Amino acid sequence: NGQANAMATVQQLDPIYVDVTQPSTALLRLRRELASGQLERAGDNAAKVSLKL
Protein backbone atom coordinates (compact mmCIF):
# COMPACT_ATOMS: atom_id res chain seq x y z
CA ASN A 1 0.00 0.00 0.00
CA GLY A 2 1.45 3.31 -1.14
CA GLN A 3 4.43 2.01 -3.08
CA ALA A 4 6.27 4.43 -5.35
CA ASN A 5 6.50 2.41 -8.56
CA ALA A 6 3.28 1.92 -10.48
CA MET A 7 1.69 -1.14 -12.05
CA ALA A 8 0.17 0.41 -15.20
CA THR A 9 -0.79 3.77 -16.68
CA VAL A 10 -4.07 5.07 -18.09
CA GLN A 11 -4.03 8.05 -20.43
CA GLN A 12 -6.63 10.27 -22.07
CA LEU A 13 -5.42 11.07 -25.58
CA ASP A 14 -8.19 13.58 -26.34
CA PRO A 15 -7.49 16.46 -25.85
CA ILE A 16 -3.72 16.99 -25.64
CA TYR A 17 -1.73 19.49 -23.61
CA VAL A 18 1.18 21.06 -25.47
CA ASP A 19 3.67 22.64 -23.08
CA VAL A 20 6.03 24.91 -24.99
CA THR A 21 8.84 27.09 -23.70
CA GLN A 22 10.38 30.45 -24.51
CA PRO A 23 13.29 32.37 -22.96
CA SER A 24 12.60 35.15 -20.49
CA THR A 25 14.67 37.73 -22.39
CA ALA A 26 12.42 37.27 -25.43
CA LEU A 27 9.39 37.82 -23.19
CA LEU A 28 11.12 40.89 -21.73
CA ARG A 29 11.83 42.52 -25.09
CA LEU A 30 8.34 41.58 -26.29
CA ARG A 31 6.81 43.23 -23.22
CA ARG A 32 9.03 46.29 -23.72
CA GLU A 33 8.20 46.72 -27.41
CA LEU A 34 4.55 45.83 -26.70
CA ALA A 35 4.13 49.01 -24.64
CA SER A 36 7.00 51.35 -25.52
CA GLY A 37 7.39 52.39 -29.12
CA GLN A 38 4.94 50.99 -31.63
CA LEU A 39 1.94 49.14 -30.22
CA GLU A 40 1.95 45.50 -31.30
CA ARG A 41 -1.86 45.24 -30.80
CA ALA A 42 -2.23 41.50 -30.18
CA GLY A 43 -5.96 41.63 -30.83
CA ASP A 44 -8.42 38.77 -31.16
CA ASN A 45 -6.43 35.91 -32.73
CA ALA A 46 -3.75 35.97 -30.02
CA ALA A 47 -5.40 32.83 -28.66
CA LYS A 48 -4.81 31.04 -31.98
CA VAL A 49 -1.94 28.53 -31.94
CA SER A 50 -0.93 26.05 -34.64
CA LEU A 51 1.89 23.53 -34.45
CA LYS A 52 4.17 21.51 -36.69
CA LEU A 53 5.56 18.05 -36.06
Partner: protein, 50 residues
Protein backbone atom coordinates in the same frame (compact mmCIF):
# COMPACT_ATOMS: atom_id res chain seq x y z
CA UNK B 1 28.80 28.28 -38.06
CA UNK B 2 32.54 27.73 -38.44
CA UNK B 3 32.17 24.37 -40.26
CA UNK B 4 34.62 22.31 -38.25
CA UNK B 5 36.60 19.76 -40.26
CA UNK B 6 36.53 16.65 -38.12
CA UNK B 7 38.61 13.82 -39.70
CA UNK B 8 39.24 12.03 -43.01
CA UNK B 9 37.53 9.26 -44.95
CA UNK B 10 38.09 7.22 -48.10
CA UNK B 11 36.25 7.84 -51.36
CA UNK B 12 37.08 5.90 -54.57
CA UNK B 13 40.54 5.12 -53.24
CA UNK B 14 41.19 8.78 -52.42
CA UNK B 15 41.45 10.34 -48.97
CA UNK B 16 38.97 13.19 -48.55
CA UNK B 17 37.78 15.39 -45.70
CA UNK B 18 34.53 15.40 -43.72
CA UNK B 19 33.08 18.63 -42.33
CA UNK B 20 30.42 19.57 -39.81
CA UNK B 21 28.18 22.63 -39.95
CA UNK B 22 24.56 23.55 -39.38
CA UNK B 23 22.03 23.50 -42.19
CA UNK B 24 21.75 26.62 -44.38
CA UNK B 25 18.28 27.45 -43.06
CA UNK B 26 19.68 27.74 -39.53
CA UNK B 27 22.39 30.38 -40.17
CA UNK B 28 21.18 33.28 -42.32
CA UNK B 29 19.98 36.08 -40.00
CA UNK B 30 20.94 37.17 -36.46
CA UNK B 31 17.73 35.84 -34.89
CA UNK B 32 18.65 32.39 -36.24
CA UNK B 33 21.43 32.68 -33.64
CA UNK B 34 18.60 32.15 -31.15
CA UNK B 35 17.74 28.80 -32.77
CA UNK B 36 20.64 26.87 -31.20
CA UNK B 37 20.67 25.11 -27.84
CA UNK B 38 23.32 23.93 -25.38
CA UNK B 39 22.97 21.23 -22.74
CA UNK B 40 23.76 22.38 -19.22
CA UNK B 41 25.25 20.29 -16.43
CA UNK B 42 21.82 19.25 -15.15
CA UNK B 43 20.93 17.79 -18.54
CA UNK B 44 18.45 20.26 -20.02
CA UNK B 45 18.75 22.45 -23.09
CA UNK B 46 19.10 26.22 -22.74
CA UNK B 47 18.75 28.44 -25.84
CA UNK B 48 21.53 30.62 -27.13
CA UNK B 49 19.65 33.91 -26.75
CA UNK B 50 19.15 33.33 -23.03
Amino acid sequence: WGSSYVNDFIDRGRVKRVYLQGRPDARMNPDDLSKWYVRNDKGEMVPFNA
